[PDB]
Design a protein around this ligand. Structure first.
Ligand SMILES: [Mg+2]
Ligand SMILES: [Mg+2]
Ligand SMILES: [Mg+2]
Ligand SMILES: [Mg+2]
Ligand SMILES: [Mg+2]
Ligand SMILES: [Mg+2]
Ligand SMILES: [Mg+2]
Ligand SMILES: [Mg+2]
Ligand SMILES: [Mg+2]
Ligand SMILES: [Mg+2]
Ligand SMILES: [Mg+2]
Ligand SMILES: [Mg+2]
Ligand SMILES: [Mg+2]
Ligand SMILES: [Mg+2]
Ligand SMILES: [Mg+2]
Ligand SMILES: [Mg+2]
Ligand SMILES: [Mg+2]
Ligand SMILES: [Mg+2]
Ligand code: NA
Lengths: 65, 182, 71, 67, 152, 143, 102, 135
RNA sequence: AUAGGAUAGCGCAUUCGGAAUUCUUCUCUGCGGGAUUCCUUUGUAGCACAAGGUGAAAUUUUGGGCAACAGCAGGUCUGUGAUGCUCCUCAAUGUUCUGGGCGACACGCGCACUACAAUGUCAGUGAGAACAAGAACUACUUGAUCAAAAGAGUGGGGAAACCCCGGAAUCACAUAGACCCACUUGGGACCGAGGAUUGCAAUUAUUGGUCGCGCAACGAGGAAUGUCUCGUAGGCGCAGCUCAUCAAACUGUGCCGAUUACGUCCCU
């Protein structure tokens, strides 16, 4: 369960607008291959910039808009 | 002559921290004497994250038509609950409560086909409190065991990750369904 | 469905005075389930033990009583 | 049916219209039934206050001409 | 020691001690002395028509008399109607909404009469009831006993 | 000697509490004639006691405080009283001490709770016709 | 000596203040001792009724109000002198009462 | 009460042709008899000199005999007339208290009295309708 | 303390109810002041926005009232001495008086009230509101009381002056109180027998109070469906109006006091 930091909020994406799409940067060691790796994912619940997430899988990008 | 507050004049706040890094900024450990404060915590969007965690727990007990508005009663129930938790675990009750909140809610959820999504830190804290108070309320409905014992059992099991907890059972099922729709 | 005695017998009374004082957490509800007695008389039995300094009172309220074993 | 005949200024909403507007209504009886008549007048406004209120309209701003 | 003097404080008066501790201490003193007058009607009577069951405490009349004595100390000149507001409750009407009712003035009239016989209460000037000099002395003396944890 | 007396009020909902602070031989704080340790429940006693523990009991060494509070309810009066006590200490130091001492105390109160000195302005909303309360409309049925 | 009390009542706030001020100035011309004036609490009468004649449509109401203003002034003067003070024309809708305190 | 159970404890006690559960308090075990309520049961215990905190079923035969006598004739033991459930019988004019099966028997006679008289209340009872003005 | 925890104080100890001085912190209120995107930064491409600051209050300050032009065969001829046409008019469709009905019930539908219990019921004890009304009818105190209640009865006072220091209910209690998971001390429908009270008149029970019945369902409610974003929802009482007597209703008032969102155009 890696931890990612939200660095940009793209906008509400659901039809009812209850899901937000964000761009997160993976927090990893300096020598780790996941250094500064960035992903776009979908988030449920109130969130803003500088929040942190617990990614159960880090090999899946979300479809934009 | 000024001294740091202790909850119910018994439990110390120093050294209180959560081991879940993601929830580090959404669980407040500010010292207080009693879980009662007439603040405007719903004025702004994320302002409620700064309310002390024990008062958040107290607000979760005033739910049905019998309990709405009975905040002084909720404080009395919490006073006995912390004592029972201390006897069961032989450690600081505040630390045990913080642990239960840190791992009482799922991290992956499924929303409308159905898609698997992640959960923001604010919702993780909100859901853990909601589920634990819900499990104890139904366990004590028509039962010899009183409410403080039911609440103490739910919190101690949740802090250890045991499946006997109502919140833990619901957490595992939700995460399992989300991975199915991954 | 539950059957709870409303008065002590010889055997249950001895069980109260020997097994109970060694529990970590003592509560009338817990003792009632253990000894199969009504909560009303389990509460009265615990008061007698506390008077003789066999158990220690921890948290007290008009409707709640929590006890524990002595050192 | 109804008919209306207008000319000039007239304010209708708010509370100030009860001070600047003087109105009356009467019932008139023809040979075939009743007739309703109404009259409204927007008062000019006099400083003395005898004919209309002395205060100006609640949404008029006047700038004093400098010397 | 939990009964030591706090700095320069000495003595005690009413309102400096727990209300319940004073009331149950006075009630015991009345019963032990056995000079107060207890009417026979208290054996079979409800405290008020707003209650549904008997007072359930065999010493309820002694407690009630001690309670009204403390009330007169706090509010001199009070009458039976004023005391009924203090001892009222909310009544159950079945399938209809509840309302509050004042207590019956009968037992309150008896209680004041019993205290008057003991020489603790006198009919105050311009209506109402008030404490005698002896009654005022009795109340404060018992308060000091409660403070030093003496009791019965 | 000089009387050394100040007065101060505090408000909460419809509750109004008036506190009189006087220099005396020994510290003595009573509200409506009842000492602090005789106030129930213990939860409301702790809220009132915060006005002392926040700054420390040493600043109430030889002060006698009497608080009279009317209106409101069981909880409103407790909050009104604690504000009158806290504001009373500040007013006393403003009148019979210097500014550096007064400023230090005021910061400690504000860092803990803003409502120890500033009154909460919330009031109950009036009822309107066609509603059972301030905002609850009547039940609507179609069939 | 004796004290005389004047009470002023009306439903028009502007009228009450004008009458009260004139009494104050006239009294000070005669060099009398004045207590007051005191602004007594203002009372409002309320009546709410349904707007519609008959019964039909959404149940709507309107609220009618009517306020009453009251002032009192105390004078230390003989009854002959207070008659001189109050002997002036007044606005309509204002009534003044004279009583002698004990 | 911390008192050990006696050898003669009875789970069901026979009293006035009624089975009374012996596991409940004496005042609340007596109310299972028809014609005795919570208010009346406390008075019976007081007149019989029985502790109200002792459990039923521990009552002896002598105590049960005394209780039956008080219930049968409350007026003998100085119970006021306003406390009884039949204060002036319409057909007899005597104050008394009804209990056990006599409550049902007298109720049947009251209905038959009204019906034979052809009163409005009696007619409503015959057809099985409300009688106190309910709609 | 019967077994007594935790919780401030350690020049002049603290309480209660006659006479004097002084004085407006609290209360009363007619006219004023005060907040304006005012200050800083961001996204910025003039109009503006977001986050902070100042502050009692920071965005239409909060909540109301008023609200254009066109229409509906919407409602009201049961508000009026508002009305055209039409009907009855001396055993009258006018008007009085007596009685009955508008309340009847195997039934269906809308909106409420009380519950299904232990975050409880019962019995004590504590502290403690606001809007109002009153003949110029409401209400205090004392008898009744050498023995239920509800009543009767006597003096006295009254629109910031009496009621009134307005003793509301949620609530609190380390009360060392009773009950212990059961249709049970949950629930209180239905019904019996005394008695008092309003009224000229209580029968179809006008309304209170006492004992009894409680073996009437009801153990959380299918498909469906209503309202709501902060002193708000929910819970809790009080006043006014109707009113000789009767509030499960409406119009206001205060008390305790949250969860969630601060978004969208999927449904309407
Ligand atoms: Mg339970
Ligand atoms: Mg407008
Ligand atoms: Mg009371
Ligand atoms: Mg109830
Ligand atoms: Mg009820
Ligand atoms: Mg109710
Ligand atoms: Mg039509
Ligand atoms: Mg016509
Ligand atoms: Mg008409
Ligand atoms: Mg009309
Ligand atoms: Mg005729
Ligand atoms: Mg006709
Ligand atoms: Mg009808
Ligand atoms: Mg409760
Ligand atoms: Mg039952
Ligand atoms: Mg019941
Ligand atoms: Mg109606
Ligand atoms: Mg749409
Ligand atoms: Na049940």
């Amino acid at each position: 369960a890696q931890v990612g930091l939200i660095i940009k909020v793209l906008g509400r994406t659901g039809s009812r607008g209850n899901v937000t799409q964000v761009r997160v940067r993976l927090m990893a060691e300096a020598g780790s291959p996941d250094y500064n790796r960035t992903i776009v994912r979908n988030v449920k619940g109130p969130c803003k910039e500088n929040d942190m997430l617990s990614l159960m899988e880090t090999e899946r990008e979300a479809r934009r808009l | 002559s000024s001294k740091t507050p202790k909850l119910f004049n018994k439990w110390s706040f120093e050294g209180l921290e959560t081991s879940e890094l993601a929830l580090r900024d959404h669980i407040s450990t500010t010292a207080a004497y009693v879980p009662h404060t007439s603040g405007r915590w719903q004025k702004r969007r994320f302002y409620k994250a700064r309310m002390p965690i024990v008062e958040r727990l107290a607000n979760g007990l005033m739910f049905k038509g019998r309990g709405n508005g009975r905040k002084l009663q909720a404080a009395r129930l919490l006073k006995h609950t912390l004592e029972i938790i201390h006897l069961l675990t032989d450690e600081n009750p505040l630390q045990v409560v913080v642990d239960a909140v840190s791992k009482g809610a799922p991290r992956e959820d499924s929303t409308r086909r159905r898609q698997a999504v992640d959960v923001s830190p604010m919702r993780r804290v909100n859901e853990a409190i909601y589920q634990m108070c819900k499990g104890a309320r139904e366990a004590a409905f028509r039962n010899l065991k009183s409410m403080p014992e039911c609440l103490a059992d739910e919190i101690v099991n949740a802090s250890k990750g045991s499946s006997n907890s109502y919140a833990i059972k619901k957490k595992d099922e939700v995460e399992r369904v989300a991975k199915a729709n991954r | 469905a539950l059957q709870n005695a409303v008065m002590f017998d010889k055997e249950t009374y001895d069980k109260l005075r020997s097994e109970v004082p060694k529990y970590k957490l003592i509560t009338p509800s817990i003792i009632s389930d253990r000894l199969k007695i009504a909560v009303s008389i389990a509460a009265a039995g615990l008061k007698q033990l506390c008077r003789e300094k066999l158990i220690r009172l921890v948290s007290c309220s008009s409707k709640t009583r929590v006890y524990t074993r002595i050192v | 049916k109804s008919m209306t005949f207008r000319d000039g200024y007239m304010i209708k909403s708010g509370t100030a219209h009860k001070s600047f507007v003087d109105s009356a209504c009467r019932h008139c009886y023809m040979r075939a039934g009743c007739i309703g008549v109404k009259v409204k007048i927007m008062l000019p406004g006099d400083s003395t206050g005898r004919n209309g209120p002395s205060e100006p309209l609640p949404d008029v701003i006047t700038v004093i001409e400098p010397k | 020691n939990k009964i030591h003097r706090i700095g320069k404080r000495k003595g005690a008066t009413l309102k400096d001690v727990s209300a319940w501790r004073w009331i149950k201490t006075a009630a015991r003193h009345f019963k032990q002395e056995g000079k107060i007058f207890v009417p026979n009607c208290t054996e079979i009577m409800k405290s008020s028509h707003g209650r549904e069951r008997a007072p359930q405490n065999p010493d309820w009349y002694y407690i009630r008399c001690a309670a009204v004595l403390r009330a007169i100390y706090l509010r001199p000149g009070v009458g039976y109607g004023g005391l009924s507001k203090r001892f009222g409750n909310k009544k159950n009407y079945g399938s209809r909404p509840e309302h509050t009712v004042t207590s019956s003035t009968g037992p309150l009239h008896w209680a004041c009469k019993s205290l008057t016989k003991l020489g603790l209460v006198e009919p105050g000037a311009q209506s109402g009831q008030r404490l005698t000099r002896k009654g005022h002395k009795f109340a404060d003396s018992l308060a000091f006993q409660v403070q030093i944890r003496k009791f019965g | 000697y000089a009387l050394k007396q100040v007065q101060t009020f505090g408000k909460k909902k419809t509750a109004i509490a008036v506190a009189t602070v006087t220099k005396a031989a020994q510290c003595n704080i009573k509200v409506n004639g009842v000492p602090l340790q005789q106030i129930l429940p213990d939860t409301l006693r702790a809220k009132i006691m915060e006005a002392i523990t926040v700054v420390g009991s040493k600043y109430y060494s030889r002060l006698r405080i009497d608080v009279a509070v009317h209106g409101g309810g069981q909880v409103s009066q407790a909050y009104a009283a604690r504000q009158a006590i806290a504001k009373g200490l500040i007013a006393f130091f403003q009148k019979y001490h210097n500014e550096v001492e007064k400023a230090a105390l005021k910061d400690k109160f504000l860092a803990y709770d803003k409502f120890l000195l500033i009154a909460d302005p919330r009031r109950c909303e009036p009822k309107k016709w066609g509603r059972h309360s301030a905002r609850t409309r009547f039940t609507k049925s179609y069939r | 000596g004796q004290t005389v009390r004047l009470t002023i009542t009306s439903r028009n706030a502007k009228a009450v203040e004008s009458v009260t001020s004139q009494l104050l100035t006239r009294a000070r011309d005669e060099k009398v001792t004045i207590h007051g004036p005191v602004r007594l609490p203002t009372r409002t009468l309320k009546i709410t009724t349904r707007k519609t004649p008959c019964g039909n449509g959404t149940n709507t109401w309107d609220t009618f109000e009517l306020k009453i203003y009251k002032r009192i002034i105390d004078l230390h003067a003989p009854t002959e002198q207070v008659k001189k003070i109050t002997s002036f024309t007044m606005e309509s809708g204002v009534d003044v009462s004279i009583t002698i305190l004990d | 009460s911390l008192t050990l159970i006696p050898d003669h404890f009875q789970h069901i006690v026979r009293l006035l042709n009624t089975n009374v559960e012996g596991k409940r308090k004496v005042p609340f075990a007596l109310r299972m008899v028809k014609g005795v309520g919570i208010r009346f049961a406390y008075l019976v215990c007081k007149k019989a000199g029985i502790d109200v905190e002792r459990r039923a079923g521990t009552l002896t035969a002598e105590e049960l005999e005394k209780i039956a006598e008080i219930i049968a004739d409350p007026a003998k033991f100085k119970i006021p007339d306003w406390f009884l459930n039949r204060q002036r019988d319409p057909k007899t004019g005597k104050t008394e208290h009804l209990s056990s099966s006599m409550v049902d028997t007298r109720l049947r006679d009251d209905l038959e009295r009204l019906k034979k008289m052809r009163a409005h209340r009696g007619v409503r009872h015959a057809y099985g309708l409300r009688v106190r003005g309910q709609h």
